[PDB]
Amino acid sequence: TYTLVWKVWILAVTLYYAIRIPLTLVFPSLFSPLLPLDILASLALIADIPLDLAFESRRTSGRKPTLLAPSRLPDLLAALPLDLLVFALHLPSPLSLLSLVRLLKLISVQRSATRILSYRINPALLRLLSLVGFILLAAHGIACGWMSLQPPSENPAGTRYLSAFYWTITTLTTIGYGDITPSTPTQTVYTIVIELLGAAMYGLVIGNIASLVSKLDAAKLLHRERVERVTAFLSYKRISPELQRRIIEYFDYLWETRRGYEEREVLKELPHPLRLAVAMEIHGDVIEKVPLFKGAGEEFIRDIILHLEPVIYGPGEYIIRAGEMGSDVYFINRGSVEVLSADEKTRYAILSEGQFFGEMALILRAPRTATVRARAFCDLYRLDKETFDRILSRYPEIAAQIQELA
Amino acid sequence: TYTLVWKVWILAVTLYYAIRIPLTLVFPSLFSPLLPLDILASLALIADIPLDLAFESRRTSGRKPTLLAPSRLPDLLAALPLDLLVFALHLPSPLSLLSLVRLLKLISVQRSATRILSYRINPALLRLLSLVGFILLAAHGIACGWMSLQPPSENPAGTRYLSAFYWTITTLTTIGYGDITPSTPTQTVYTIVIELLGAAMYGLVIGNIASLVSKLDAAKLLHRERVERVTAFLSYKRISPELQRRIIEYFDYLWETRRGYEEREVLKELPHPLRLAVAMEIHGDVIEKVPLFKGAGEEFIRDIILHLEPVIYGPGEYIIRAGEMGSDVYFINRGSVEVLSADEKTRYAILSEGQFFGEMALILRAPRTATVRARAFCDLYRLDKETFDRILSRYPEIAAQIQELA
Amino acid sequence: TYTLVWKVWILAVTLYYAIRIPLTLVFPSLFSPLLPLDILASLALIADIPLDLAFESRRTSGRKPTLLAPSRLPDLLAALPLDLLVFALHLPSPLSLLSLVRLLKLISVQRSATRILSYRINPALLRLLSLVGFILLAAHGIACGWMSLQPPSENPAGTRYLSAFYWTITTLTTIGYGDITPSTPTQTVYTIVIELLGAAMYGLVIGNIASLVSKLDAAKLLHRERVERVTAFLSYKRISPELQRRIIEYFDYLWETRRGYEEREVLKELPHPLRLAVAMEIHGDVIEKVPLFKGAGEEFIRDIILHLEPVIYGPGEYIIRAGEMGSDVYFINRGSVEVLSADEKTRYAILSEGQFFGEMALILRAPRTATVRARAFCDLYRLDKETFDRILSRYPEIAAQIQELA
Amino acid sequence: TYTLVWKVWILAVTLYYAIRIPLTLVFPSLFSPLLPLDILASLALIADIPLDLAFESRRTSGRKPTLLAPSRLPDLLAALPLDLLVFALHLPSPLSLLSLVRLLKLISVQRSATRILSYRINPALLRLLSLVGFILLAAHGIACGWMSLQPPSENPAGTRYLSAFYWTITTLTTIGYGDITPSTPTQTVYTIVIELLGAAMYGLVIGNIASLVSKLDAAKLLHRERVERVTAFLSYKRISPELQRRIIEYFDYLWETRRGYEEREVLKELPHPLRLAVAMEIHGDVIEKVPLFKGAGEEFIRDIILHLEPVIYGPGEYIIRAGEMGSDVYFINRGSVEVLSADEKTRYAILSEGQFFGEMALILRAPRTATVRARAFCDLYRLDKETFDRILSRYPEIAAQIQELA
Ligand SMILES: Nc1ncnc2c1ncn2[C@@H]1O[C@@H]2COP(=O)(O)O[C@H]2[C@H]1O
Ligand SMILES: Nc1ncnc2c1ncn2[C@@H]1O[C@@H]2COP(=O)(O)O[C@H]2[C@H]1O
């Protein structure tokens, strides 16, 4: 949308004001040669007042003020051509400061950037970058103020501005070389207030950096503290080192795969329709592929899919042991698994991605026919007999169908 | 209440003490011309001791001490007219410091402001502002102490105080120009202790700023990390980009509407009566408007309303598909929805705010008569058949009424 | 226990070492006059090695090393009388530094203080205070090192130590006056390493302060953000201002009473026996006072009490409305409540702390006889009919007793 | 694996580049005598480009780019021998800076260390250490840049490098002695940009330190705030000091044993197979030791074990009181317990680690035969009658067996 390039243009005009206004306050001779752009800067800026008023009124509706409220005032009062008149008639120093009203546009530009950005940019990083930009603009303004109090001299404007910017950076960053310092009480008061301002600005920078880096690896720290808690509890319970190693490597696999997030908790953030869509896409072509499920309507399938629960079986450990009272069908979703004889002397089968096993427990209460043992991290899904019956009761005809299949 | 203006007056008197006491310690000639206000300052301050004792005793009751406990002592010992006597009889320097006992009122004024404010003011911002005020008062006191150690000279009191405040600000902010520095061992020791104090104060400022800005966008970061977790889990599960886009825009709608808060968790903070009131106001004139509900007493309505659960259906996705085994009535609460034929070739109806659909599943087990599909984000509420029966069992007469309606 | 005074004595001896060793390294003449205390310091310190080994071995058992492991080594190698020999034979500078091995006792004293304290002292505040103490000791040591590199001069030892401490404080606090600076390459290298160390130490101070103050009002911020979330969700749902005000004042009452903690979640931290004890003490002499409960054994009472759930009814709102299907007994626990006629034209009763109402719903399904309305914040407890029956089924004889009472 | 020593070698070569390139930029005479190692440095570095491409392609598969993407570019463009050619033909200053392209290897070495480490090293501490290393390398580079702008002089290269490093450390650490400062506009601009960079670097150091120490005792603070909440809620409920003391010591035991972690929540992080393994190892040889359990298959045992719930009975408080309606078997797991007569006048038994009691309630509804009272913190497990029946229903034959045992 072309509103973005307009916002960028308004940002450039605001930066032009922030640079020029204090720079031409100390250098009146700089006013007239840049007068065309100022007109270009002014006609644009006032034009932004109603135009942007449209772009914000047409979202979320509810009418918008144009002469009221704490909001929309910093733009309104910054629209006035106070700078043009005050420079044109050469108003004296203590009243020429009214030219700074253009700088009030900054606190509206920051709000605009808070929604032009902050989709693709971290909000803490966005706040830090806005603070850095404001600090640089303030450093320019403070250098101009420092120049305004220096005794007049024949030094080139460039070198005196460089000295003023050197001093203001030295102060704002609290480095404080002190090679150039106030020589007069007014410079002393200005330096005191600038020292307070610089301490506040550097504290803001440090606080924003800490806020950023304190959450820079939130997932990693959340997983690590979870592992630490689990390991400490196991060590208290005097669990053998081998089982702790198996748990450690399970957590390592879980982190390397899905960054430590619990599978069941992630599919709890989503609403029911989105959970249904996600589950139907995860379990696509693996649930209608079941023989005892085939032929049932998709309202049965969608009810079945929402109740499958994830379970990460580790490598080499048992999922099913023959002769037990098996009561849970399974569906493989990332790993592979081996079906072995009751004595594990021979391998019946190898199953992989999109395959399933344990169907018999759905149709019959018979004990398990064979052992099932994970080769890799199986990363599969489970469905209990009792839940299957509960969700089957609402579909009597397919219950009779599966009873006939038995 | 007039107690607020009294507290503000006591704050002003305490600031007057904090300004004058160290300033007149180095300038004895300043004592006598301000003596009237000191009397005004003193008669007020002692008067605050019992008076405020009332205002705190009449809340939470339980009696209050007046010569005991760590609390209420900083006010008591600060009530004493030590400053008046010590200035009146010109006690020498090492014992004149007892005039500072007025400054103990600050740690009671801060406690008072912690409850006069902190309703309408962020507690972290309140602590930061109190720290800044205390730092400025301490800067004044430290400038006075620095003046007290300077060799006597004919410089105007104003310019020497300005130099002392310049030095103390330069030190407390760790900028350290070093253009003015200790010339004598006593000034060196004072500068060492003031350097430690200033480092501690600036560390406190930075820590408070970090604590503030680390929670300045808690809701935004909590929503963003939730979105990141969901997206990472989806990407691990190899979900298609279009479904991820639909989930992303659902989360965007949820944030723009209710700032990322889960609807069910917010109505869990409230107690049962407040949950009932909030639910009755959300679902007002949308639940008695139901035909199969009309005529039932309000104890049935209030039982029904507490069990409605929220579900945000996304735009263009199905809520009801014809021919299924529908078992859930619905109530629209923000969006709009279209009722379409079983082949979606023609639109039966458009429903909006305060409308409902799916009534049939309450009265009959018949399959759905038509499809229902969200136009916008529907943002609606659902009620299951089984929950409806469970809460209906306690009202047999209206169960018979609805059975007759069928 | 006398072990505390022994630990305090060992702390004092360690501080004596930390002060004297670098101070006498630059001042050899200070060694001999303090030799007695050094013997006193040494005979004690070695004596601490086995003695404390007992005090830690007799807790948690499991045997302890005495010549092994990363732990217990800093104490062992600090026990050696390296300082006494190195000062007695006047070993030259580059090898005299071995006297510093006494300072290794600090990292054991800190560990000891981490368990002598940290019961009654905040762990973050304890870490900050230990850091401050270590920083002051390091400042003394660094001042001694700075003196060691200064060209020899006839200045008094006191004033040169004061200048060195001034410089080291100026550097460690990053203030950096620069009135005294390296004059030689070795002093330059020492200043570089001390600048790195001071930057690290001041960063540690700031980080510890931020960690402390970022959790200084955890309860207040946790309650405030909960209130903000609730209010934002209500405002999205367009709830009337009066209901929002009632919710705001409910949250204010909850904070002022129990600091924002959910009553049900606090009695979830405790184990079953402690939950039972706490509940029996909360509901003492209010549950046997019930007429339809009197005479039952205390195994019935203790089963009843664990199932009472808390509910804070706000002032002026209804708890019971006459003619409804009441199914929940109530017990008042902080507030008061008024029993009013079905038309609220006359007050039947006022009930307060330790009183109860709604008994009839336990014995009979009859509709409520009268309205019950909170005067204050009632802050009471509730018991459902269905839960009462479920916990009654295990006591058939008292069920028959209450059936006879009906 | 030998890949680790190769990564360490590549790290050493990258550090060699970071040290030499800016050092030989200001000292051309240093180029030729180190030319052999440069060849050794270069032939290795290019060799790393495909070789490491293998080591990362053989994990997680999916093919890898070699001329594309933001990743793998900093290594590619750093492989080029720009330094060798630019030094060999003595390209002038403003274009000789292209030799710095070797330094782009740093942002790949950091990524490599992020996975060579971060298993055994805290990620926040790892980030802090990487930042410190980068800051030291940048300090060397900035010292070289400062030397590049100094007017030429006959001072030894060592002492001028020492002065430059002194200045850059003084600036980056914000200490700012100001004994050496820019004398020319170009040095002023360089100092301004270096002041900004140093402020940013020191803010990064402080932020990383705060992020580290704000989570340095997460478990301790999480337990302490839980204790504070519990104690505040108890004090609001006016619970007696003795019960609060018992709760305080229960929490102290819980912290000293398992660091404040809830037993039930830790065995919720693990998946079902790992939960089963951990439970089977915790309850090994204590569940088959039961007489009414012996003889049942291990599918019954494994179903029983998953349902045992932990409960920490405090010292001296009752677990079982005679004559009640006992309905829960128990298993001791850390502590000891005393079985006492119904009048507690005589002790029937003392049971300890691995023992059990309360078996009768499983087989019969008879009231408890004797009292059971904890000596120490019992730290045991419980199993309800109703849960036992629910998990028994799936094994009818052993239900008949236990019915015969009765
Ligand atoms: N003509 C219509 N106008 C409005 N709503 C309709 C119309 N026809 C069907 N519906 C609704 O569409 C719903 C879909 O089938 P249900 O049985 O769920 O209940 C149906 C009605 O509530
Ligand atoms: N005169 C009274 N004095 C005290 N309590 C009363 C009186 N009349 C009614 N109640 C209580 O008011 C309650 C409201 O009806 P319930 O059936 O819930 O049980 C009723 C009694 O507990």
Side-chain angles (χ1 to χ4, degrees), chain B residues 10 21 23 26 46 52 57 61 64 69 95 102 158 192 217 221 236 252 281-282 290 367 373 382 392 399:
Chain B
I10 289 304
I21 294 295
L23 186 57
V26 305
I46 176 73
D52 176 68
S57 60
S61 67
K64 295 285 186 177
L95 202 48
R102 298 299 198 183
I192 291 182
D217 267 318
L221 274 308
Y236 165 73
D252 287 348
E281 185 160 322
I282 290 177
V290 182
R373 194 170 179 179
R382 189 183 68 99
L392 179 71

Side-chain angles (χ1 to χ4, degrees), chain B residues 117-180:
Chain B
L117 287 321
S118 164
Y119 283 99
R120 55 205 71 93
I121 293 300
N122 191 295
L125 178 58
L126 180 62
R127 174 168 288 107
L128 177 59
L129 293 181
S130 180
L131 179 65
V132 170
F134 161 73
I135 281 191
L136 287 183
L137 270 48
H140 175 68
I142 293 172
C144 295
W146 177 260
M147 279 189 298
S148 68
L149 302 180
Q150 283 282 110
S153 61
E154 307 297 330
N155 301 95
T159 193
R160 60 181 297 188
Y161 171 77
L162 182 57
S163 300
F165 201 80
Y166 168 62
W167 170 87
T168 188
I169 287 307
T170 309
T171 302
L172 267 49
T173 58
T174 68
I175 292 183
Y177 291 134
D179 49 357
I180 44 183

Side-chain angles (χ1 to χ4, degrees), chain C residues 119-397:
Chain C
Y119 283 99
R120 55 205 71 93
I121 293 300
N122 191 295
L125 178 58
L126 180 62
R127 174 168 287 107
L128 177 59
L129 293 181
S130 180
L131 179 65
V132 170
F134 161 73
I135 281 191
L136 287 183
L137 270 49
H140 175 68
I142 293 172
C144 295
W146 177 260
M147 279 189 298
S148 68
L149 302 180
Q150 283 282 110
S153 61
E154 307 297 330
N155 301 95
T159 193
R160 60 181 297 188
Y161 171 77
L162 182 57
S163 299
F165 201 80
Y166 168 62
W167 170 87
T168 188
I169 287 307
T170 309
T171 302
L172 267 49
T173 58
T174 68
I175 292 183
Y177 291 134
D179 49 357
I180 44 183
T181 43
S183 307
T184 47
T186 166
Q187 283 185 329
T188 304
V189 178
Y190 182 77
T191 289
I192 291 182
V193 65
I194 291 313
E195 280 184 315
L196 264 75
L197 187 60
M201 287 181 175
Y202 194 45
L204 279 173
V205 157
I206 297 178
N208 279 115
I209 291 182
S211 174
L212 199 160
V213 307
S214 57
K215 56 178 63 64
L216 188 55
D217 267 318
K220 178 89 74 60
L221 274 308
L222 188 59
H223 174 81
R224 192 178 192 88
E225 73 95 31
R226 177 173 130 120
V227 172
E228 290 283 349
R229 158 175 59 258
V230 170
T231 48
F233 179 84
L234 295 166
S235 59
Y236 165 72
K237 290 296 180 177
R238 297 188 262 101
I239 302 306
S240 63
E242 49 267 37
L243 187 47
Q244 299 196 38
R245 210 282 327 272
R246 202 154 103 247
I247 291 162
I248 281 295
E249 59 178 329
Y250 153 81
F251 278 135
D252 287 348
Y253 169 85
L254 196 105
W255 166 258
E256 291 186 348
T257 46
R258 58 218 79 186
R259 303 186 59 89
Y261 299 135
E262 188 172 355
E263 301 80 358
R264 298 178 302 173
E265 301 300 327
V266 177
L267 305 179
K268 194 181 300 301
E269 318 270 23
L270 300 176
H272 172 75
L274 286 184
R275 289 201 307 261
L276 178 58
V278 171
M280 287 293 298
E281 185 160 322
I282 290 177
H283 306 108
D285 196 13
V286 311
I287 189 73
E288 59 274 49
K289 203 159 55 187
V290 182
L292 66 102
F293 285 160
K294 77 192 179 186
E298 315 305 311
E299 66 285 354
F300 174 83
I301 274 73
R302 70 183 72 265
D303 284 358
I304 293 283
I305 293 299
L306 285 171
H307 289 87
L308 301 183
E309 64 173 25
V311 47
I312 318 299
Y313 277 92
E317 64 187 5
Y318 297 94
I319 307 180
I320 289 176
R321 264 163 289 198
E324 77 188 6
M325 179 51 194
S327 305
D328 49 350
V329 83
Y330 289 97
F331 300 91
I332 311 163
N333 191 249
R334 196 49 58 98
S336 57
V337 77
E338 303 182 12
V339 180
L340 276 282
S341 60
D343 52 2
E344 308 192 51
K345 295 305 179 178
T346 178
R347 172 186 303 104
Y348 289 169
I350 169 72
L351 316 174
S352 179
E353 164 78 306
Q355 205 66 14
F356 67 100
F357 58 92
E359 48 190 341
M360 311 303 297
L362 298 180
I363 62 182
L364 192 56
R365 320 292 79 83
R368 294 291 201 194
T369 60
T371 66
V372 190
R373 194 170 179 179
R375 164 183 296 185
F377 286 90
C378 264
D379 196 326
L380 45 80
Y381 283 79
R382 188 183 68 99
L383 174 60
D384 310 66
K385 146 65 48 183
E386 67 91 31
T387 301
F388 178 72
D389 286 0
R390 282 193 290 102
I391 59 198
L392 179 71
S393 60
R394 45 170 61 179
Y395 303 109
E397 63 92 6

Side-chain angles (χ1 to χ4, degrees), chain D residues 308-333:
Chain D
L308 301 183
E309 64 173 25
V311 47
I312 318 299
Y313 277 92
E317 64 187 5
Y318 297 94
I319 307 180
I320 289 176
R321 264 163 289 198
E324 77 188 6
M325 179 51 194
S327 305
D328 49 350
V329 83
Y330 289 97
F331 300 91
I332 311 163
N333 191 249

